[PDB]
Amino acid sequence: DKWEMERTDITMKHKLGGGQYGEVYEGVWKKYSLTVAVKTLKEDTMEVEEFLKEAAVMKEIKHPNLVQLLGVCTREPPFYIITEFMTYGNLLDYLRECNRQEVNAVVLLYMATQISSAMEYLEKKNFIHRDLAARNCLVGENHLVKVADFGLSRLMTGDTYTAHAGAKFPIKWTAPESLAYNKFSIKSDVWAFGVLLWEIATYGMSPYPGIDLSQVYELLEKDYRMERPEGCPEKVYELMRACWQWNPSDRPSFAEIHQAFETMFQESS
Ligand SMILES: Cc1cc(Nc2cc(N3CCN(C)CC3)nc(Sc3ccc(NC(=O)C4CC4)cc3)n2)[nH]n1
């Protein structure tokens, strides 16, 4: 189709992300002399049919805060996924390494607003992300933020995906129903967003610090929750806590979350 590229239309410049993100490069889309992100997938690093579905899904995503697909090479391995280049890389290192006089309270609101905007779009369009976290958000000029959207899944909003047993999750971002029953839904993304909020409010501290992963589920079922971060506005902490309701249906929608942050951000200005 229109998205398919020739592998030679692109030239690679630099390895990106120190291994933490696989075979990924800063590249050049030669025609337009445009810097792009390139992800190359060797065989035996993914199942082909599922990769193609993930690529098919990206093709339908158009939102200012979701990484924009530019093209794909999907005939002979290695496969390429080509996207717009986000200059500053992942939001986790960005929060950790930033000048906080510049990346201040109002910028943090701005970043949370952008991300919830992305998630509201996914919510409207029947997708779930299942790995929402600061490390999977990308930052560009002027604190522009985009959620990485390569591995999204089609699921009717409100329905539940039951992942296979033996599936491994990033425990500290993972909702109770997901940890216990492998059940994922837009509401488990809302849970994960709450943790993303905490990462933002703390400028990229590791969540549940010091806590053994084996004990996290048990703590949560007894209504333990991370404490309000130093400096974090109470309304924002309230949003965090609303996102970490035990009952999935008690969590707000992303449409409601984004509106709340919209207000705060425009007010903070
Ligand atoms: C997708 C995308 C990624 C980027 N930009 C960047 C930029 C970046 N660098 C920015 C500059 N610092 C100093 C080093 C890291 N490091 C990464 S690390 C990285 C690279 C790729 C992916 N993911 C993908 O390519 C998925 C879409 C196929 C995730 C993280 N990504 N722009 N657009």
Side-chain angles (χ1 to χ4, degrees), residues 6-43 45-75 77-268:
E6 264 292 348
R7 188 170 288 108
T8 55
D9 296 334
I10 289 289
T11 176
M12 323 278 237
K13 292 181 65 172
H14 316 303
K15 274 163 288 185
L16 288 173
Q20 198 214 303
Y21 297 91
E23 319 288 24
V24 291
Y25 305 82
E26 186 183 353
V28 189
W29 193 358
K30 290 184 285 195
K31 258 197 317 299
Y32 310 105
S33 305
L34 174 65
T35 297
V36 301
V38 187
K39 188 183 185 187
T40 83
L41 308 203
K42 300 169 180 163
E43 57 186 20
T45 73
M46 108 297 307
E47 195 286 305
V48 171
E49 298 300 342
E50 172 58 24
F51 168 85
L52 284 178
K53 186 177 193 159
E54 286 168 29
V57 169
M58 279 175 93
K59 292 180 186 173
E60 295 165 30
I61 307 290
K62 185 95 178 305
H63 189 276
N65 302 110
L66 279 153
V67 175
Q68 180 59 51
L69 184 73
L70 291 180
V72 308
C73 309
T74 64
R75 284 187 264 104
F79 290 142
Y80 288 17
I81 294 286
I82 307 133
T83 56
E84 67 182 302
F85 188 63
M86 307 302 297
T87 298
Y88 295 104
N90 80 82
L91 177 68
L92 185 49
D93 293 319
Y94 185 89
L95 286 177
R96 286 180 177 176
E97 293 170 345
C98 70
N99 172 351
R100 307 196 175 176
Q101 287 311 285
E102 183 191 336
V103 184
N104 52 27
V106 89
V107 171
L108 299 181
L109 281 164
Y110 183 41
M111 299 188 311
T113 304
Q114 289 176 84
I115 294 148
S116 65
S117 187
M119 295 308 301
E120 173 179 3
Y121 176 91
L122 293 188
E123 180 176 77
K124 177 185 149 80
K125 292 311 197 53
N126 293 306
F127 301 115
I128 55 162
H129 193 297
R130 280 138 58 229
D131 199 359
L132 196 67
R135 68 178 174 271
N136 289 329
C137 296
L138 295 153
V139 183
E141 282 68 23
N142 305 312
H143 318 297
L144 173 63
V145 180
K146 306 199 184 199
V147 179
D149 53 14
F150 164 50
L152 302 173
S153 296
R154 309 193 186 276
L155 176 71
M156 293 308 294
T157 296
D159 276 18
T160 280
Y161 163 51
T162 302
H164 68 105
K168 274 155 293 197
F169 314 132
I171 297 314
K172 299 192 168 202
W173 288 257
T174 306
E177 64 277 11
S178 315
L179 287 169
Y181 308 131
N182 283 8
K183 305 207 177 299
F184 293 85
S185 77
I186 192 62
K187 292 314 191 174
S188 33
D189 280 355
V190 165
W191 178 289
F193 177 83
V195 179
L196 178 40
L197 272 187
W198 194 90
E199 304 188 81
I200 292 171
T202 62
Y203 290 90
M205 281 174 38
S206 255
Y208 305 97
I211 312 280
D212 308 322
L213 299 157
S214 313
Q215 288 192 77
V216 165
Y217 183 74
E218 287 118 287
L219 288 171
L220 297 173
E221 59 187 341
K222 297 173 182 67
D223 204 37
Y224 175 82
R225 299 291 189 273
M226 285 184 286
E227 66 283 38
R228 167 183 178 179
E230 187 165 30
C232 175
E234 174 62 58
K235 279 196 197 304
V236 175
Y237 185 61
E238 275 180 88
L239 273 173
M240 290 193 207
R241 297 300 299 254
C243 293
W244 302 330
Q245 290 303 317
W246 181 269
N247 210 330
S249 48
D250 291 340
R251 301 163 203 165
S253 61
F254 283 109
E256 295 172 325
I257 290 171
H258 170 261
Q259 187 59 62
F261 276 109
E262 181 80 274
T263 304
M264 294 185 241
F265 173 56
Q266 294 304 345
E267 279 192 6
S268 232

